[PDB]
Amino acid sequence: DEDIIAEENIVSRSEFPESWLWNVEDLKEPPKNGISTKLMNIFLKD
Amino acid sequence: GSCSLEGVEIKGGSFRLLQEGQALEYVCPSGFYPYPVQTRTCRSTGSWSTLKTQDQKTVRKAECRAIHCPRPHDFENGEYWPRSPYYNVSDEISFHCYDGYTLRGSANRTCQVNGRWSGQTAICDNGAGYCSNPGIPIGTRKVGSQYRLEDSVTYHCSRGLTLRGSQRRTCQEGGSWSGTEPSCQDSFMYDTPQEVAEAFLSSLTETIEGVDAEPSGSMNIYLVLDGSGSIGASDFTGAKKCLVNLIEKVASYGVKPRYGLVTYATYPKIWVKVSEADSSNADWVTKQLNEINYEDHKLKSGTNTKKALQAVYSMMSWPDDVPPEGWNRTRHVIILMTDGLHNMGGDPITVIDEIRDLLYIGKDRKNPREDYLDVYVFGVGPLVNQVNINALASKKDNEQHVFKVKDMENLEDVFYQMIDESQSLSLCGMVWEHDYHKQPWQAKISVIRPSKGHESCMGAVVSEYFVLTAAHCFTVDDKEHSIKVSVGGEKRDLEIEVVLFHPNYNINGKKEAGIPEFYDYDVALIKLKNKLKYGQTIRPICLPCTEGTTRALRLPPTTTCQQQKEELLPAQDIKALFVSEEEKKLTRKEVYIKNGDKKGSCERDAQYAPGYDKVKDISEVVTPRFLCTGGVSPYADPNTCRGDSGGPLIVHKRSRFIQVGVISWGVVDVCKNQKRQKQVPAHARDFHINLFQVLPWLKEKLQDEDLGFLAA
Amino acid sequence: IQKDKVTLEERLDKACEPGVDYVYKTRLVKVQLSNDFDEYIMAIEQ
Ligand SMILES: *[C@@H]1O[C@H](CO)[C@@H](O)[C@H](O)[C@H]1NC(C)=O
Numbered sequence: 001d002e003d004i005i006a007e008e009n010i011v012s013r014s015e016f017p018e019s020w021l022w023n024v025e026d027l028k029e030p031p032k033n034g035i036s037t038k039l040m041n042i043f044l045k046d
Numbered sequence: 047g048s049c050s051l052e053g054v055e056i057k058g059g060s061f062r063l064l065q066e067g068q069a070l071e072y073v074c075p076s077g078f079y080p081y082p083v084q085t086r087t088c089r090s091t092g093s094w095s096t097l098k099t100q101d102q103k104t105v106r107k108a109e110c111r112a113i114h115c116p117r118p119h120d121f122e123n124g125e126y127w128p129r130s131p132y133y134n135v136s137d138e139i140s141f142h143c144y145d146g147y148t149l150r151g152s153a154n155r156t157c158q159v160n161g162r163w164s165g166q167t168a169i170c171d172n173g174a175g176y177c178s179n180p181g182i183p184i185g186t187r188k189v190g191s192q193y194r195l196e197d198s199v200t201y202h203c204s205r206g207l208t209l210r211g212s213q214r215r216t217c218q219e220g221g222s223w224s225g226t227e228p229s230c231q232d233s234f235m236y237d238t239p240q241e242v243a244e245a246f247l248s249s250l251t252e253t254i255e256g257v258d259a260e261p262s263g264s265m266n267i268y269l270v271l272d273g274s275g276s277i278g279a280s281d282f283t284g285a286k287k288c289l290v291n292l293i294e295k296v297a298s299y300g301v302k303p304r305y306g307l308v309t310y311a312t313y314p315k316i317w318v319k320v321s322e323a324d325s326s327n328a329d330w331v332t333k334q335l336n337e338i339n340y341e342d343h344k345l346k347s348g349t350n351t352k353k354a355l356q357a358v359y360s361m362m363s364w365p366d367d368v369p370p371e372g373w374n375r376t377r378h379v380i381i382l383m384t385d386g387l388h389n390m391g392g393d394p395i396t397v398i399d400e401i402r403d404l405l406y407i408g409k410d411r412k413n414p415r416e417d418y419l420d421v422y423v424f425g426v427g428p429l430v431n432q433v434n435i436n437a438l439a440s441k442k443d444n445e446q447h448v449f450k451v452k453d454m455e456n457l458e459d460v461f462y463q464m465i466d467e468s469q470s471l472s473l474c475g476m477v478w479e480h481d482y483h484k485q486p487w488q489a490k491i492s493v494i495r496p497s498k499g500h501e502s503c504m505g506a507v508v509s510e511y512f513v514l515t516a517a518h519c520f521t522v523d524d525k526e527h528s529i530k531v532s533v534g535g536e537k538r539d540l541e542i543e544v545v546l547f548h549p550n551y552n553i554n555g556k557k558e559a560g561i562p563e564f565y566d567y568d569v570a571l572i573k574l575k576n577k578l579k580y581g582q583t584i585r586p587i588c589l590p591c592t593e594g595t596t597r598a599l600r601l602p603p604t605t606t607c608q609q610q611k612e613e614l615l616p617a618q619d620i621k622a623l624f625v626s627e628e629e630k631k632l633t634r635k636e637v638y639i640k641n642g643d644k645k646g647s648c649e650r651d652a653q654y655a656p657g658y659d660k661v662k663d664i665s666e667v668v669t670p671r672f673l674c675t676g677g678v679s680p681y682a683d684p685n686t687c688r689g690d691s692g693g694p695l696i697v698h699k700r701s702r703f704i705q706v707g708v709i710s711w712g713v714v715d716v717c718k719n720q721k722r723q724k725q726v727p728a729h730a731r732d733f734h735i736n737l738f739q740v741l742p743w744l745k746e747k748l749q750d751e752d753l754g755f756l757a758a
Numbered sequence: 759i760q761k762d763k764v765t766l767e768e769r770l771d772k773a774c775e776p777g778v779d780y781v782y783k784t785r786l787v788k789v790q791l792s793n794d795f796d797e798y799i800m801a802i803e804q
Pocket residue numbers: 374
């Protein structure tokens with residue numbers, strides 16, 4: 001008479017910033033039509 | 047009776063019976079570790095010892111979990127990626143600070159087989175506090191953003207992890223946090239034979255170098271071996287041989303300290319006392335370490351670590367009466383092997399505190415005397431409580447005192463590698479006792495010229511022949527018979543051989559642009575004619591990018607030249623100092639190196655300098671080979687005089703003195719052989735010569751001085 | 759702790775646990791009991 005997931009194997013969230021992603025990027029990709037594009041891969045908070 | 051083997055195995059693994067069925071050891075296939083505990087004892091109740099984790103939690107079924115590394119559940123002023131509920135082996139993670147923050151340490155770290163992360167701890171500091179950001183070690187959680195003076199920070203590890211080191215660190219005066227850097231440990235991380243030997247010597251040898259100041263060296267080594275029945279003759283006899291090599295290792299350093307061998311169980315047993323006349327004899331102490339046997343404490347196989355340390359207390363105590371002659375000059379090094387599983391006597395920590403009070407340590411805000419006591423602990427027993435063995439071991443900055451090797455065989459290899467290896471033992475930037483002359487490196491230069499001249503400059507002893515100093519203090523016209531150098535406060539003058547100027551030095555190479563003075567590459571060495579005998583008044587000073595400085599900063603031998611520049615000269619308001627002469631008496635002047643965002647403000651003030659009042663571009667008179675100091679922000683830094691010219695720009699860290707610059711020129715002359723200006727302008731800056739820029743020249747001219755310069 | 763026969767060996771192991779610090783045979787002299795906590799004045803026979 002039991003199931004669910006063990007309360008031991010539950011990675012609780014913790015990262016709840018009010019502000020982040022405070023970095024800098026430079027557009028050096030091959031310009032087309034005068035428009036440069038950059039594809040960033042960021043990690044969303046919790 | 048033998049405990050029943052009913053439901054005592056482990057899922058996805060196995061186990062084996064040892065000590066004739068009195069204990070079992072779980073054997074999990076490579077890539078996995080026994081959970082929770084490694085081994086189990088056979089209680090006399092008929093059942094095996096309950097499965098207790100690190101949080102003292104009861105587990106029903108044992109399982110073989112994969113080797114995971116601690117998760118960074120706390121990181122500030124930056125961002126780490128990728129993020130996962132758990133990190134397997136050979137998993138890589140990178141760190142990156144925000145805008146306006148400097149990243150020190152290893153940016154990329156990989157999870158190793160020892161359940162730990164490679165490289166150093168990643169820290170994102172802005173350099174706005176009195177002390178550098180303590181950072182947040184992977185797996186820990188720092189509480190305290192304020193890094194002012196007297197401020198403190200607390201650390202907390204995740205559930206199921208044992209905190210190693212200090213849980214609280216206070217920003218002490220002089221830009222340095224008390225205790226040591228925390229580190230969340232698990233129950234299988236251990237320490238490679240190299241990690242132990244490397245962190246042990248780097249923490250011991252340094253505590254030995256200072257001892258030589260200065261028969262019978264003023265240092266005591268207390269060898270406390272645990273012979274309880276919870277260790278076994280296997281892990282015991284191995285610990286003996288482990289110590290045997292240690293004594294011989296210390297002997298190779300040509301030092302003969304006072305040893306004290308003590309094996310304890312239910313009651314202490316002193317074999318060698320420091321008060322004996324044979325305590326200095328390494329040979330005898332070794333033979334006494336051989337006569338002992340694990341069978342000595344079989345009848346009464348107890349574990350009373352308290353009485354053990356108390357036995358050491360009586361060896362360093364005194365009638366009183368004494369008050370001994372030289373009690374405040376003796377270093378004490380207590381080394382003890384133990385599983386940390388004490389059960390008789392209570393908390394052995396109480397004794398350690400009594401020892402501190404007896405040696406008067408940590409009882410003075412101005413004189414900590416922490417360098418007069420080291421406590422090294424080594425886990426030997428099958429079940430070792432990292433919590434306890436840590437509470438006893440000392441906590442010093444950038445030093446490790448807690449050790450837990452994989453097995454006994456590895457613990458031996460730790461001391462085998464020592465006997466063969468002979469780390470460089472140099473005393474650069476060192477201070478002796480402490481009349482009054484705490485600046486051995488300091489040198490006073492005088493150049494006699496027609497009419498009068500008496501050019502008054504200063505230098506710094508960097509070797510047994512060469513003395514680093516300014517270059518403008520001399521000229522091509524000045525011969526060697528007209529140049530005299532005095533060191534150690536000696537009345538006589540030393541005869542020089544040749545003054546080597548920098549190949550790129552040209553003070554008169556800017557007159558075309560209307561620039562009378564040009565102190566670019568303003569450095570020069572002075573090779574003496576006679577060899578200098580180092581004493582309590584004469585002693586070299588650490589130079590950037592040297593094997594000697596690497597140890598001074600307590601950094602790994604694999605430290606590159608670039609790493610040292612980031613340590614000594616960060617992108618912040620560095621706290622340095624220089625030597626000034628007031629009323630025929632040397633005195634220190636604490637200043638700040640403007641290497642942060644206040645760098646431009648300090649440089650552009652070179653326009654007020656005589657002759658530079660009509661310079662088009664101020665960046666031409668202030669080459670990257672300059673370190674700007676002095677000013678009003680953040681504090682009112684003392685200015686350099688004319689006689690102080692050529693003086694060493696030292697950075698006092700880790701109780702060591704590292705020269706990083708050379709006094710070149712100042713904006714406003716505040717010294718006129720009368721009184722101090724007192725009304726100094728807010729633009730009265732002082733410029734120096736960054737040694738990190740003139741390395742190629744120093745490394746070449748000092749190739750035959752055994753200073754061990756790094757390649758890079 | 760607890761309360762099914764607690765033999766001799768049972769007490770030996772439970773008394774020599776790393777946690778166990780003090781082991782006394784006391785005699786209840788006086789009982790000063792209150793509302794939030796009860797004082798129990800014991801006398802260490804040995
Ligand atoms: C060392 O001992 C002597 C005892 O006369 C004392 O005067 C001196 O202050 C002590 N030195 C230190 C480091 O305090």
